[PDB]
C-alpha cells in the first residue's frame, strides 16, 4: 500500500473506525500524504469536497472520545490534525478553498462541542505549562496568524471576525494579561487576534476597557487598561537593567521589547475617544509610558511617544503629577535624534500645557521655552528639503513648537479681566530669544517659501499668531523687528506677511481647509494692525502693503464676525491716511460700506464713515 491509497482508506474508514490507536495511525497517514503529494494528483473540480472531507475529520478528531485516554495521546493526535489544518491556511493550492476553513469556525450548537470552542480551548494558558499540549497551543496560534495575515477577501475577513466574538475566546485571551503571568508566556499572536476582533468595533473597545462600568469610575481591574499597563510595567521591570548591546543574541529581551511595543499599539487602538484616554490617564498611564521609554531602544521609544501624543489632549492631565514626567520628556526631546520622536514630544507638550497654569510653570522651570527655540532653529528652510514626507514632518514640528509658545504667551498679555501676570527674568530671556534675527529670518521664510506640503497652511496661520502675541507682550523689544531682512527675498516681515496672504488666495477651494484659510486672513489683518501700533510703524506698514488688494473686499461675503469687520475698516482707513491715492485705485462695494455706517455696533459705525470720507464722490 502506497501513501495515496493508504490515505484514502483512512479517509473512507475514519467515521466507522472508533478505535483510538487506529485513529492516530490514520491521522499520521493523512498528514504524511498531504505533506508529500500536496493534493497534486487530485482533480481540480473535486477539490472542494476533498478539503471538506479532511476538514470534517480534523473537526471529528478534536472531539472528546468517551474512553478515558492520557494527555500524551490527545497531544499526538491533535498535533497531526492541527498541522494539517495549519497547512490548509498557507498552502497556495488550498487558497481558493479557504472559505471552507473559515466556515468551520461558524457556531452550529453555541456550546463546547463547536469547532471554535475546541480550538480556543487549545490556546488556554494552563496548557502552556503542559509538556505535550504546549506544542498544540503553538500550532493553533500559527493558524490564527495565518488566516488573519492571509485572507484577502474582505467579506471573508468580516465573517471570520464575527465567528471569533464569543465570551470564552476573549476570556481565554485576556488570561494572558493577568498580573501573575510572566510576560514571556505571551505569544505575539495574542496581539494579532485582539487587533483583529477590535478593528472597527467601537463597542468591543468599550467592552474591553469599561467592562460595562460607568465611564467616570476608575477603569475596572478586569479590563484592559489596568491589565495592559501592568504588562507594560512587568516587562519593563525585566528588561530595565539589561544591556541593549546583547539584543542580537538575546531572544528573551527581544521578545519583551516586542511585547511592550505591541501593548503600546493595542492601547492606541483601544483609546478611541475622550472617556477612554481620560480613563487611561487616571490609571497612571502617562507615568507608565514615561517610565518604560527610559529603555534605550528606538522602536520602543517611538511607540511610547506615539501613544503619549494620542492621549495628550486629556483633561485629566490637569490632575496628574507632572513635576517629574515633564522635565524627563523635555530632556528626551532635547537629545533624541529622530524626527518622529521630536514630532510626538512637541505635539504632546503643546496639548499638555494648554489651559493648565501649574503645568506651564513646570515647563518654564525646565526651560521649555528655550527648548522650543532650539528645536525650531535646528532645521533648514522648508525650501531646502527634497523628500515630501520629511518636509511635512519638519513643518508639523515647527507648528507644534509655535503652538506651545502661543499657549505660554497668553499669561503675560494684559487682559481687562484683571489677570495681568508679571514675567520673571527667567521667562523673559526665554521669550526674548524669539525676536533674535536668526529665528525671525527662519520664521518669515516659512511664511513665503515657494511648496506642496499638507501642513503648510496651518503652519503659516500659527506663525502669524506667534507674531501677534509676541508683539503684544510688554517686555518684548519691538524696535529691531521691522529691520530684519531675509537673504532670499530681500523683504522684511511686511513683505513676507503679504506673500502668505497672496498664496492663500491661490490655494484650491476645499471645504476641509476653508476654516483655516479664513483664520489666516483674519490674523493677517490683525497682525498688520499690531505692527502699526506696537512698532510705531503706521507709515511703513501702509506703504509696504502695496502687494495687498483692497482689504474691504474681504467683507463682500457674509462676514458676521464683528472684530474682523472692525479690523478691516480700521486697517483700510490707516492705509489711506498714508497712501491717499489707493482710494481711487481700489474697487469697493460702496453701498455695502454705507450700510456699515448704520451698524448696531458703534465702533464699526464710527470706522465705517471715517473710511467713507476717503473715497471719491463718484
Amino acid at each position: 500500500m502506497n501513501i495515496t491509497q493508504a490515505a484514502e482508506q483512512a479517509i473512507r474508514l475514519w467515521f466507522n473506525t472508533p478505535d483510538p490507536m487506529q485513529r492516530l495511525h490514520m491521522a499520521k497517514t493523512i498528514r504524511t500524504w498531504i505533506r508529500q503529494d500536496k493534493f497534486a494528483q487530485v482533480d481540480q473540480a473535486n477539490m472542494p469536497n476533498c478539503v471538506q472531507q479532511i476538514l470534517n475529520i480534523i473537526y471529528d478528531g478534536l472531539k472528546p472520545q468517551p474512553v478515558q485516554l492520557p494527555i500524551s495521546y490527545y497531544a499526538q493526535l491533535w498535533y497531526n490534525l492541527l498541522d494539517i489544518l495549519r497547512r490548509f491556511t498557507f498552502l497556495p493550492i488550498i487558497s481558493p478553498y479557504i472559505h471552507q476553513v473559515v466556515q468551520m469556525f461558524c457556531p452550529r450548537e453555541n456550546g463546547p462541542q463547536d469547532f471554535r470552542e475546541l480550538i480556543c480551548n487549545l490556546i488556554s494558558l494552563n496548557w502552556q505549562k503542559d509538556p505535550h499540549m504546549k506544542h498544540c497551543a503553538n500550532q493553533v496560534f500559527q493558524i490564527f496568524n495565518c488566516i488573519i495575515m492571509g485572507v484577502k477577501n474582505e467579506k471573508l475577513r468580516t465573517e471570520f471576525a464575527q465567528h471569533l466574538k464569543f465570551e470564552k475566546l476573549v476570556g481565554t485571551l485576556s488570561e494572558y494579561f493577568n498580573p501573575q503571568v510572566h510576560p514571556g508566556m505571551i505569544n505575539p499572536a495574542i496581539f494579532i487576534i485582539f487587533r483583529f476582533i477590535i478593528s472597527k468595533d467601537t463597542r468591543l473597545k468599550d467592552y474591553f476597557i469599561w467592562n460595562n462600568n460607568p465611564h467616570d469610575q476608575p477603569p475596572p481591574p478586569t479590563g484592559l487598561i489596568i491589565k495592559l499597563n501592568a504588562v507594560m510595567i512587568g516587562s519593563y521591570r525585566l528588561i530595565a537593567g539589561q544591556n541593549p548591546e546583547t539584543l542580537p543574541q538575546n531572544p528573551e529581551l527581544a521578545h519583551l521589547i516586542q511585547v511592550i511595543i505591541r501593548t503600546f499599539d493595542l492601547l492606541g487602538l483601544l483609546l478611541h475617544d475622550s472617556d477612554a484616554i481620560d480613563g487611561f490617564v487616571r490609571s497612571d498611564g502617562v507615568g507608565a509610558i514615561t517610565t518604560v521609554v527610559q529603555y534605550p531602544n528606538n522602536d520602543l521609544i517611538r511607540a511610547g511617544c506615539k501613544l503619549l501624543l494620542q492621549v495628550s489632549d486629556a483633561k485629566a492631565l490637569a490632575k496628574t503629577p507632572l513635576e517629574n514626567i515633564l522635565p524627563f520628556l523635555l530632556r528626551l526631546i532635547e537629545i533624541h535624534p529622530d524626527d518622529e520622536v521630536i514630532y510626538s514630544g512637541t505635539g504632546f507638550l503643546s496639548n499638555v500645557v494648554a489651559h493648565k497654569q501649574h503645568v506651564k510653570d513646570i515647563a518654564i522651570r525646565s526651560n521649555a521655552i528655550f527648548l522650543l527655540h532650539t528645536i525650531i532653529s535646528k532645521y533648514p528652510r522648508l525650501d531646502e528639503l527634497t523628500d515630501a514626507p520629511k518636509r511635512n514632518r519638519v513643518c508639523e514640528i515647527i507648528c507644534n513648537c509655535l503652538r506651545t509658545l502661543n499657549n505660554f504667551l497668553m499669561m503675560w498679555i494684559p487682559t481687562p479681566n484683571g489677570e495681568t501676570k508679571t514675567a520673571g527674568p527667567n521667562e523673559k530671556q526665554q521669550v526674548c530669544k524669539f525676536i533674535e534675527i536668526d529665528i525671525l529670518k527662519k520664521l518669515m521664510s516659512c511664511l513665503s517659501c515657494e511648496m506642496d506640503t499638507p501642513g503648510l497652511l496651518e503652519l503659516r496661520s500659527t506663525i502669524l499668531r506667534s507674531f501677534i502675541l509676541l508683539l503684544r507682550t510688554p517686555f518684548v523689544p519691538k524696535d529691531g523687528v521691522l529691520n530684519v531682512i531675509d537673504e532670499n527675498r530681500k523683504e522684511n516681515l511686511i513683505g513676507h506677511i503679504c506673500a502668505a496672504y497672496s498664496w492663500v488666495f491661490r490655494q484650491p477651494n476645499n471645504t476641509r481647509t476653508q476654516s483655516t484659510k479664513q483664520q489666516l486672513v483674519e490674523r493677517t489683518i490683525s497682525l498688520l494692525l499690531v505692527l502699526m501700533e506696537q512698532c510705531g510703524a503706521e507709515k511703513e506698514v501702509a506703504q509696504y502693503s502695496y502687494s495687498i488688494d483692497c482689504p474691504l473686499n474681504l467683507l463682500n461675503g457674509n462676514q458676521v464676525k464683528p472684530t474682523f469687520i472692525h479690523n478691516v475698516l480700521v486697517v483700510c482707513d490707516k492705509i489711506l491716511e498714508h497712501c491717499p491715492t489707493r482710494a481711487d485705485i481700489w474697487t469697493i462695494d460702496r453701498p455695502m460700506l454705507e450700510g456699515l455706517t448704520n451698524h448696531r455696533n458703534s465702533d464699526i459705525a464710527k470706522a465705517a464713515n471715517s473710511l467713507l470720507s476717503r473715497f471719491p464722490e463718484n
Binding site: 501624543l309 494620542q310 505635539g347 503643546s350 496639548n351 500645557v353 494648554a354 489651559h355 503652538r403 502661543n406
Partner: peptide
C-alpha cells in the same frame, strides 16, 4: 483661549 490639537 489656549489651542489644543487632536492627534487621533
Amino acid at each position: 483661549g489656549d489651542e489644543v490639537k487632536v492627534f487621533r
